[PDB]
Structure formats: C-alpha cells, structure tokens
Paper text:
The [name] sialidase of [name], one of the bacteria associated with severe periodontal disease plays a role in virulence.
After establishing the IC50 of these inhibitors with purified [name], we attempted co-crystallisation and crystal soaking with DANA and Oseltamivir since both had IC50 in the μM range. While we were unable to identify DANA in any crystal models, we could solve a model at 1.9 Å with Oseltamivir in the active site after soaking it into the [name]-apo crystals at a concentration of 5 mM. The cyclohexene ring itself is sitting in a distorted boat conformation caused by the carboxyl group taking a pseudoequatorial position upon the binding of the arginine triad. The amino group of oseltamivir (position C9) interacts with the carboxylates of D237 and D280 while the N-acetyl tail sits in a hydrophobic pocket with a hydrogen bond forming between the amide of the N-acetyl and the carboxylate of D280.
Numbering used by the authors:
A (entry chain B), B (entry chain A): 34 to 552
C-alpha cells in the first residue's frame, strides 16, 4: 500500500563501514508481506567510483507504545559504543542484500516475511577510504515492490548528502570519549584539531582528561595519529583522575606560525565537577589553573606547560578558564583567546585575554556581559573585536563589540536576536576579502541551530559584519542529536573546515565550499 | 589529631587483584603531612597463608562540595568497567607500599605529602586464587603515624570479612553486563547458576539478551566456562536485539535430577521495555513467550526451547513470565515455578505454576495478591506452599500460603510486616531437618535488607516456618550498592550458597555455614 522514506541530513563518514543513506518505515504490513525489490537512483553527476558498497538491512519492528512516525527502533550505527563505532550493530540490523559495484540504478532484494504493522529497513552506503571530502551523493528510492506490486513511496528524501571523516571515535586509543573541539589552519595550510581525551567516561573535569591533537597536511583527507598536546599525569603524587586538563582553545600566531593551546588544569577536587567545586585563591590546590603549551614545528611537537594563572586570574574568582574552540591573531599581530570567569558570587562572565608580545605575557580587563560563559572572538573590522557568547538566559547568542581589547564593551545590533541557541558552545571566525574566493569580508558561524537540545549543526555566513545571517547563506550538516560543540577554520581560499561533536563521531571533520554557503 | 577507618562489609573476591580491606579518611591534614606508617593486625586463627598481597593506596582528596563524612572520592574497584573489574582503577589510586608475605602484624609506609584538609588512603587485600570460600579475616588498623606521631584512630572496623568469587564480571566473554541470578544444587552436589547475558548494555528486555549458565563441581571454588542455556539469535529473520530471552528461573527435579530453566522470550518490540510493551494475545509477534530448556546430564548440555505459553497464559494478560531465581520439587514430586502476570488493566499479580508429570504439562490457577510481581516459593510443611512476594506498595514482602497449589490463598502472619524490602527480587528456600547439620526445619531468605535503595544484602534464617526472623539469625554479606537480586541453594548439609548481584561483581557466589546463621 504505502511506504515512508527518510534521507537523513547527516555526514557520510569515509572511514566508516556503514552509513545511514535511507531509513524506511512500512507502517501497516500484513504478516507475510515481503519487500521483494527496492530500486535506488543516483544523480548523473555523482562519482559512483567512490562508493565501495550499498547494503539493505532489516531492523524488525517498533514497540506498541512508541507510535508510528519514527524511522528506526534504535540507533543503527553507534557513535558511543567503544567496541564498534564503524559498522551497524549486528544485533539491531540483519543484512538482506549487498552490491559492491554501484551504477546510477541499483536494485536491492529481500525474502524476509514482515510482521503485522510497522517494519523497518534502511540502506547503508560505504565509501572508499580515499573518497573526496567535497563529493556529494543525490540518492532517491524510486521503486519499492511488496508482493510483486509497486507500493506508494512518500517522504522528504531529496537531501544532497555530504562526506565527512571521523577523526576521533569513542574507544579510539583506549579513550572512552573525546569532547570540546578546537581547529586552526597553520601558515603551511596544516589543519590542527584539539580536544579532551576523556579516558574513564564522558564527564567534565574533574577526571582523567588530557588535551589531544590531530594533524592533517592534506586538507583533512588523512589525519596523523593522536599526539598529547598537554597532560599532568600523577603530578604532586595525586591520581591522574585528580589531575585532568581540558576545554582546550588553540590559535596560530599568524606572524611566526607559533601555535598556542590554552586549557584548564584541575588539581585534586575528588571526582566532582570543577564548574561547582573550583574555589577562590591562586594555587593549584585552591583553584583551576590556566595552562599553555606551544609548537614551533607546525604542531608536530609541543612545549612543556607554563602556568599563566598569576598573570590574569583575580584571586576572588572561583574559576578562570579559556573559552573552548580557538583564538585569533589580529591585523596588528595581537594574539586573542576568549575567556570566562565565575566571580565570588558564582556569576559567570565572558571576556577576552590578549598578548602583544608573541604570547610572552597575557592580560584580561573587563567582562563583556553577565551570565555568559563560552565565547569565540573575531576581528569583524580593523581594531574591532566581536565577542559571540553562550547566554544562560537561553534562546539566542549574546553579541558585544570592543575596540580596546575589553576595557569597554558595546552591545551589537545582533545581540540576543540574530543567532538562536540552546545554551551551547558556538564557533565564529572572520575571513578577509583577499583570503577567500568570494572576494568579500565574511563572518562564519557554527552551532546547533535550535533553542532546544543539540542537533541541526549548521554553518551560517554574514556579508555585513554579523548584522544579518540570511537563511540562504547556511548549510545544514547534522540534523540528529550530538554533544553540539564545533570549531571553524578556513582550509584554503575556497573551503571552510568544521571540527565538531556530531551524531556520527565524537570528533568529526567536514569541508564545505564557500560557494555552497554563498550564491 | 584524629583519623577515621572503615572496614567495609563487602565480599573479598578470590579472583580479584584488589579488594577494599580498609578505607581511611584523614579529615584535617596540614599541607606536607606524611602518613609515615600504618599497622594492621589479623586475629590468631586467620589463615594468612591464603593472603597473596596487601597494598596501601593514595586516592588524593575530596571535592569542596561533598562534605567530610565520606570514606572515598570515587569507587576504587569498578564492577561495571568492561575493560577492568579485577584491579583498582590506576587513574584513581596510586600504590604507596606492598607486602607479599603477611604476618599477624603488618606495617605499610608512604612518603606522599598530603594536601590541606581531606586525604584518602585505602588498604587492598589480594587472596590466593584457591582461597577457601569459607575462610574469614578479622583485621584492625592498630596504629597510624603522621610526622612520627601516632594519631588517634576512630571508626567501626570490627567487621568479620568473608570471601566470595566473581563468577561473572561486566565485560566477560564480550558481554556488557549480567543480571537476574538463579541457583540450584543438583542431586550430584553440582551448583548451577543462571543469569541474563546482556551483550549491548544493562537495560531490560527488549534487547540482545541470552540466558547463560555457570557450573561448579567443587562447591563454587571453580566455575566451568559459560554455557548458553537459552538463545533465540535471529529467529524469523528478526534482529537478535528484538529476540532477547531473560529473567531466568531454574529448578532441579529432585526425583530425576532433570534440571529445568524457564525464561521470557520477547520477539520484536523495537528497543523498548517489555514490561510496558508486551500486549494481550498468544503469538510471539503479540506477547512475551514462556520458554523452557532442560538438562539430563547435570547441566553440561541443554535441550532446544519448548513453548509453554499455550498451556498456562490467559490471552487477555499483557505479560506472563516466571518469577526470576529458582523453583522447587515438593515432597510429592510436584515441580513448582513462581510466576507473575500483568492483567488487561496493567495490574501485576504473583502466583505459582506447577507440573505433576515431570514437567510435561504446566498449570496456573489463581493469583495470590494484587500489585505483586517477583516471588519465590518454598514448601514450609508437607503439601503447604509459602509464596514470598515483591510488593509495589513498598516497605515489606507480601507472604501468602496455599495448600491447593494456588486455587485458594491465605495471608501468612508475617505478611507485610516481618521482612523489609525496597521493592526488589528476594530468594526464599526451605531446608528439611534430616538434610542439614542443625537437625531442624529451616527457611532461608535473602534480599537487600532496606526500605530504600539496594544494599545490605543479607541472609536471614527462621526456625518457626517464617513466623519469626530473629536479628541474631542473619548474616550481612554486602552493605554497598548493587542491583540487589539474589538466589539461595544449600551446597551440602552444613553450608548455604548465595548467587547474587553485588557491589563487587555482576554475578557473585558466597558460601555461609548454617552455624554462622544459627549460633
Ligand atoms: C565551566 C562551566 C561550563 C559552562 C556552563 O561548562 C561546560 C559545559 C559543557 C556542556 O554544556 O556540555 C561541557 C564543557 N566541558 C563544560 N566545561 C567545564 C570546564 O566543565
Ligand atoms: C514485569 C517486569 C519486571 C517485574 C516487575 O521488572 C523487572 C525489574 C527489574 C529490577 O527491578 O531490577 C529487573 C528485571 N529484569 C525486570 N524484568 C523485566 C522483564 O523487565
């Protein structure tokens, strides 16, 4: 009778064995009905030589109380199972058919007798490991035959699917999880991605957490094995689980190509959250510490940690740390790292930290706005910094401007208006006209484009210095649930990179042409 | 000044590398204070030849918000970490000292400078893998010296510590978790322990769950590798995750030594709870199925599953299943399995299912009591069955009597009064006077002895057919948190075995002398 099809707007990972290409619900089957044949068509332009395999799975039925509008009973390919993040959980999906050479038209068969009511099938797509990150698939279920009669196909399934790469999967290198992405592009065009390595579980500091780094010299097609950018092991003879460092922020000093990573080292504090347990004072026994490493060799090797806590932290603050993601070099060569501090009354404020001496000494002035935390900063115009802030009020990003490196702040017109959020980290970068193919100054922004939950990870572009974010100048990458944090860096003149927590992997990299954003 | 010591009443596992013997809190240290020496003393009659090693660990400090009355900042030895359930998580505990030859007096040293305020240390004990399950340690911290001055020792640390064995640990044989213990003793004195094998996670049916079995010919000192007693894999071409079977109940037919295992097979139901999603009807597509396997070779090999659903399940019931744990043979040779059914209005009832034909045909009559679920049955006196029930009203076990195999029920004097519970599975068995060393009829009962949470797993004995459970006739085995389910079986004339979910392992076995219960 009737069959529903979903083409989910989620990344096809080039390093995965399985990727959800279609989910399919047959809502009102009679017991014994067989999906004899289903035909997929790929668009004319699609590079079918890059597809290694297409599979048709059966995932059985639905629970009587979970309704009839779902496209699956369970996650088909897990992003958390430390034993398998790369293939379909074989306990939830049974392969019906497989094709290892893919033409524009493809048929998949089954002889599986359906149950009465809801039955779930899904198409998996496996790409070649060397598949272009810039390739796209346009796929449609054109025919479904049940008991040798072609059934009616319904559903929105016209999505243009993009590639990505799972730089870090849950369980990689004995690590439980990876969180809190940062991304910069070195002067040599090298992509450097930083993250928490959370060994024991996925809970925030305090825990056994190191700062990791993934390096790519080929615009993200391949990533060199994980380096530990910063670690404190069993410092002062306290357990490694009372010595975590994380929430990393990375910048490239564009004048020297010296790379800096800043992070919060929590020392002691039992097995409880630093957010609530970091207390006033200055010593490592008293409060979270602001720690920095540097790389002079394009991110290959990393200096020992220097403690900058004494330079910038007020003693009365419960907690000073970087804003996670990245910092910037300004036109005049000032290095800028967004920061956040919880004051004596447990009220969080977003601000900036800067250095005028190639990162030798760091300074913080005034907070931008009350009840904000995680922020990212861009030089929207010469000498003028735009701070884009996570706001505990909910619903929308706070936006301020400073022309004096945070001594005074002014509200931007886009404040609490233009950029929706659910209270989550967001990435903002600026691109100079001469440094990109459109030949105009850009602001690029990424976050979960929702007021509730963390999903619909989206890159947005502004042509007018973040006054307007036109709906036409946006690309949806991941419409399913994840931990939500992202970071942007331009790869080259034509493409932006995004390093983000996604529905398909803890650290996901995707590349998007500027001309896909802007008509 | 003052130092606090805890001797936690939890099983010392003979198969573990580490076991918590003592937790110690130093509440108000000065920064730099060193625990120079700590002396532990064992009773004269203790078998110190069974101790392989004793270790002193440092676990650092406590979080500012978690108070000053805790004995640890974190679980030291995990019962859930699939990568390590046998040794202390090295990220939470740093070894200070170790002794491989243990005398009646033992000293442990450190040179670790303490932090200001709370510092945590703990003593680990490792036993010989062949340590007697009936051996006990009586250990006391007699001295603690800080900066070469003997500090004041406080705390209740007079516990007589018992041995146990982790039959199943989280992660064993590629399984995420194990739940729902059942235990019988065959006519050959063989222990047979059954459980859910939960491969994907620890959630109830519906999921990828098999019934496992562990067999011991030496009264629980050693366990043969895990056998799958019952499995439905990819039946009818539905995923194994929509084909789970669990909540096993086991009995020995004492006339034949034929062993029977009964379990609930859920077929379909998406990835949601059978408790709410099993619907009225009789077919496997419609409702949970009552399945049985048997062993004629003392539990070495298992028959294919037979479907009992047709014989005993009313079509209008949403869910019929066995009560997890064990069933019995009565004096007249009737085989009895406790059952539970959810009626058309979603109201659960506890009852019994019996066979008079060596398990050929099964019958259910009337429910004992409304809003009860998991029950265990014992033949208190000839022809007279006591049903001990989990009660959704809270606080205490329901107890009924039937002398007509459930056609009529009468409330027992102990009903909703004598046995506290938190709404959890409990074990009850009867022991004939001629079959045990005390030479009197016993009832033995085990559960979490609390009205809140699942902890203080305790065996209780009654000399007067469950009318009274004297506090003196009880043994506390596990005062820390676990999933709470237990099952009892007499090993021999002198000792009772308990197969239970514990704070130290998913499937824990311990042996207790009858004379420790009744002194
Ligand atoms: C420090 C407070 C901050 C904002 C509320 O919490 C962040 C929220 C997070 C979140 O909402 O997911 C994850 C971050 N890892 C966490 N940072 C730390 C240091 O705990
Ligand atoms: C009818 C549901 C049943 C009895 C109330 O709930 C039990 C509770 C459990 C529990 O309280 O831990 C675990 C059991 N595995 C579960 N059984 C099933 C099949 O869900």
């Amino acid at each position: 009778d009737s069959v529903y099809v979903q083409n989910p707007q989620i990344p096809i990972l080039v390093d995965r064995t399985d990727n959800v290409l279609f989910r399919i619900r047959i809502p009102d089957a009679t017991k014994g009905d067989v999906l004899n044949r289903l035909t997929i068509r790929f668009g004319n332009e699609d590079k079918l030589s890059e597809v290694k395999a297409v599979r048709l799975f059966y995932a059985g039925t639905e629970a009587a109380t979970k309704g009839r509008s779902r496209f699956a009973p369970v996650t088909y390919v897990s992003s958390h199972n430390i034993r398998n993040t790369r293939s379909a959980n074989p306990s939830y999906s049974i392969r019906q058919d497989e094709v290892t050479t893919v033409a524009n038209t493809l048929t998949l068969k089954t002889r599986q007798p359906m149950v009465k009511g809801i039955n779930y099938f899904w198409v998996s797509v496996e790409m070649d490991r060397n598949t272009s990150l810039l390739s796209k698939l346009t796929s449609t279920v054109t025919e479904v035959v049940i008991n040798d009669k072609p059934a009616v196909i319904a559903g929105e399934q016209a999505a243009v699917r993009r590639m990505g790469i799972g730089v870090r999967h849950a369980g990689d290198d004995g690590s439980a999880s990876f969180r809190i992405p940062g991304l910069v592009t070195t002067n040599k065009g090298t992509l450097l991605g930083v993250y928490d390595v959370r060994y024991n579980n996925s809970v925030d500091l305090q825990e056994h957490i190191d700062v990791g780094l993934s390096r790519s010299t080929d615009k993200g097609q391949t990533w060199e094995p994980m380096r530990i950018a910063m670690s404190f092991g069993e410092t002062d003879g306290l357990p490694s689980g009372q010595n975590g460092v994380g929430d990393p922020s990375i910048l490239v000093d564009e004048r020297t190509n010296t790379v800096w990573v800043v992070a919060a080292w929590t020392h002691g504090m039992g097995n409880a959250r630093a957010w609530t347990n970091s207390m006033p004072g200055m010593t490592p026994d008293e409060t979270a510490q602001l720690m920095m490493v540097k790389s002079t060799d394009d991110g290959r090797t990393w200096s020992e940690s220097t403690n900058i806590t004494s330079q910038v932290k007020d003693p009365s603050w419960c907690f000073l740390l970087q804003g996670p993601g990245r910092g910037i070099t300004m036109r005049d060569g000032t290095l800028v790292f967004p920061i956040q501090f919880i004051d004596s009354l447990r009220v969080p404020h977003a601000g900036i930290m800067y250095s005028k001496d190639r990162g030798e000494t760091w300074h913080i002035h005034q907070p931008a706005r009350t009840n904000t935390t995680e922020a990212q900063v861009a030089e929207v115009e010469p000498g003028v910094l735009m701070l884009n802030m996570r706001d505990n009020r909910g619903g929308s990003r706070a936006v301020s401007i400073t022309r004096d490196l945070g001594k005074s702040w002014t509200e931007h017109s886009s404040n609490r208006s233009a950029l929706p959020e659910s209270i989550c980290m967001a990435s903002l970068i600026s691109v100079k006209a001469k440094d990109n193919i459109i030949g105009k100054d850009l602001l690029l922004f990424s976050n979960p484009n929702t007021t509730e939950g963390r999903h619909h990870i989206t890159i947005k572009a502004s042509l007018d210095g973040g006054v307007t974010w036109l709906p036409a100048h946006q690309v949806l990458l991941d419409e399913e649930d994840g931990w939500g944090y992202s970071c942007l860096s331009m790869i080259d003149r034509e493409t932006v990179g995004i390093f983000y927590e996604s529905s398909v992997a803890h650290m996901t990299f995707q590349a998007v042409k500027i001309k896909d954003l802007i008509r």
